[PDB]
Ligand binder design. Structure first.
Ligand SMILES: Nc1ncnc2c1ncn2[C@@H]1O[C@H](COP(=O)(O)O)[C@@H](O)[C@H]1O
Ligand SMILES: Nc1ncnc2c1ncn2[C@@H]1O[C@H](COP(=O)(O)O)[C@@H](O)[C@H]1O
Ligand SMILES: Nc1ncnc2c1ncn2[C@@H]1O[C@H](COP(=O)(O)O)[C@@H](O)[C@H]1O
Ligand SMILES: Nc1ncnc2c1ncn2[C@@H]1O[C@H](COP(=O)(O)O)[C@@H](O)[C@H]1O
Ligand SMILES: [Cl-]
Ligand SMILES: [Cl-]
Ligand SMILES: [Cl-]
Ligand SMILES: [Cl-]
Lengths: 323, 323
């Protein structure tokens, strides 16, 4: 397993670079892609950024968001894949893995190490923190826009400094980026204050279906595909719903089952204090973090997935309570 | 107007000190009261902490919360009032202002300077930041519990680093406190993840009454007293509701009218980008910050307050749009 130094050397050695993020991009993906792309351009390299997916609405006002292309026309010397744990997550760009030397930079412990060089460090809360250190190691000078873009992923992946991954290194990075001009309020406003009215109606559906188990310590609900369509919503609109269920008093584990598209059931799990949802996720074929993890089923009825997941969660939860 | 140095000298000169916060205490009040009380105790002083109000549920697990007394039995040499902008806000302890020398420490620009010594600095987002600097100036050594307690007010008064008052000094303070052991995740979990089910039902009432004006740029709603009672709620339960209305896409100003107790109408105002709600608040007899401000009426029908406030807000908003 390569460290940062070997990645920095490899980046220094190539001058035509395609930086690729994952489908369904989140703040850390957008942050890592644009921060590395702009950093490498400041070294004079020829760099393009690509994500095989529509950029979500909340990113449309960020500086340089138009640098991320869905259909780049580029012949790179080097592929750099950021924040994507497996080749399927980069969509049509996985075809380049067979033709172009590749670097992987990722904080996900689930990363399959599919690059020729791989720097994977789960002690970071965000891949953006790794890009920050790469850019500094390369000699990149930050301006306010680059600082804002690199702050983005650290904020989003820690829930804006609320989750258990917000450790001293996260706060140090945020401080350094704000000192360099990162507009923390701009980032919060664009990410968190662009709610659709339909999102309130969709969450009302979640609350109607909400079920508590184990003396209120487990909360789960679901959104079926017809309900997304009924409210002109996609799974972009239910971002943050599972954390709202975790925020209920006395809840330790929250699970949200989301069918989107039809027959594709994503299970999002969150815990509050002590329960390791990643162990449940892993055993079901997914993965993630001790306090935030997920599983994705293809080709299943939601009526089959829900009781199987709840069954496994109850067994594990009862074991944990017994210590 | 005294600065920090004169306050530090005055604190150093007295050894029996009552630290008082304001009624309806928030995170900054609890943070400032306990951080200063514990800091002064580490200098060996005899210190009590007092708030003439029930401590809200979300603070009950914080370390040393039991140090805040509703009914202290103490004869202080010095009264220190933190985060309270006027004597009425400290309840029954305003009687001590006539008998005991008093120090005021506050970030609110509305502070009436009712102490014998007053350090009021609106450039701080939180009074807790001023207490942090006082404690360091006095030579206090932070442990993890004191760091957690001092972090609390900086986090709550910036919306956990989301609001426009989260400047480089806020992030520096947060970093320094987390480096000293502040448990940022504990604070977020206790403050933000203790929601009552009744709070979701109460917010559904807010959404039912929600009205948009000026091409969706103004949003307002209201909670009358009977509606609070119907949902076993008080105005503690509607904390954060007005920010949820601000978070609607395209909204620039959000206003929530809250009747609690009967006939007492509190108007909470939030803006997003540019509109100065403090100017509207001030003209109506309240005050606050450019992006968060309020007004409180006693003895009025909500049917009278709502159109008068909306009228003034519309006039000011239309003027601002014309630049
Ligand atoms: N303790 C925790 N650690 C990491 N992510 C957490 C978390 N609690 C909640 N989350 C959320 O889970 C998601 C994790 O994303 P993953 O690293 O791609 C983010 O949206 C993050 O805010
Ligand atoms: N099917 C899956 N396999 C592996 N990791 C997954 C996963 N679904 C989610 N995760 C990870 O778990 C965390 C929580 O995911 P989510 O926000 O979708 O609940 C994220 O960091 C995400 O990358
Ligand atoms: N720009 C801003 N500045 C200050 N407080 C803001 C704000 N936007 C929202 N708020 C909220 O308004 C309240 C201000 O409290 P005041 O200083 O007592 C806090 O709850 C804070 O989170
Ligand atoms: N009636 C009033 N007079 C002066 N300042 C007020 C006020 N009501 C609220 N504020 C201030 O305005 C900000 C927003 O108040 P609120 O959270 O109640 O909306 C807070 O910092 C608060 O101290
Ligand atoms: Cl731009
Ligand atoms: Cl992990
Ligand atoms: Cl204690
Ligand atoms: Cl101000």
């Amino acid at each position: 397993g390569s460290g940062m130094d070997e990645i920095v050397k490899v980046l220094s050695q190539h001058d035509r670079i395609l930086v690729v993020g994952h489908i369904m991009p989140d703040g850390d993906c957008v942050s890592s892609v644009l921060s590395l792309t702009l950093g490498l351009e400041k070294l004079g390299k020829e760099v393009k950024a690509a994500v095989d997916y529509k950029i979500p609405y909340v990113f449309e006002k960020f500086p340089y968001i138009d640098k991320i292309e869905e259909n780049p026309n580029f012949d790179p010397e080097l592929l750099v894949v950021v924040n994507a744990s497996s080749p399927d997550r980069i969509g049509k760009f996985q075809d380049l893995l067979d033709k172009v030397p590749s670097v992987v930079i990722d904080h996900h412990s689930t990363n399959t190490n599919f690059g020729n060089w791989n720097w994977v460090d789960p002690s970071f809360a965000a891949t953006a923190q790794m890009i920050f250190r790469i850019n500094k190691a390369l000699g990149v000078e930050y301006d306010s826009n680059l600082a804002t873009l690199n702050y983005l992923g650290i904020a989003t992946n820690t829930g804006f400094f609320r989750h258990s991954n917000a450790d001293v290194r996260v706060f140090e990075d945020a401080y350094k980026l704000v000192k360099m001009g990162a507009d923390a309020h701009f980032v919060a406003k664009e990410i968190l204050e662009n709610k659709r009215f339909e999102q309130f109606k969709l969450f009302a559906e979640v609350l109607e279906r909400l079920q508590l188990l184990e003396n209120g310590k487990i909360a789960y609900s679901y959104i079926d595909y017809d309900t997304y369509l009924r409210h002109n919503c996609t799974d972009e609109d239910s971002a943050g719903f599972v954390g709202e269920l975790r925020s209920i008093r006395g809840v330790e584990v929250a699970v949200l089952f989301m069918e989107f598209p039809r027959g594709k059931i994503h299970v999002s799990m969150r815990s509050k204090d002590w329960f390791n949802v990643n162990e449940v996720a892993f055993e079901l074929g997914g993965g993630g973090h001790p306090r935030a993890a997920g599983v994705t089923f293809e080709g299943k009825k939601i009526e089959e997935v829900i009781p199987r997941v709840i069954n496994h969660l109850l067994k594990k939860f009862k074991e944990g309570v017994e210590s």
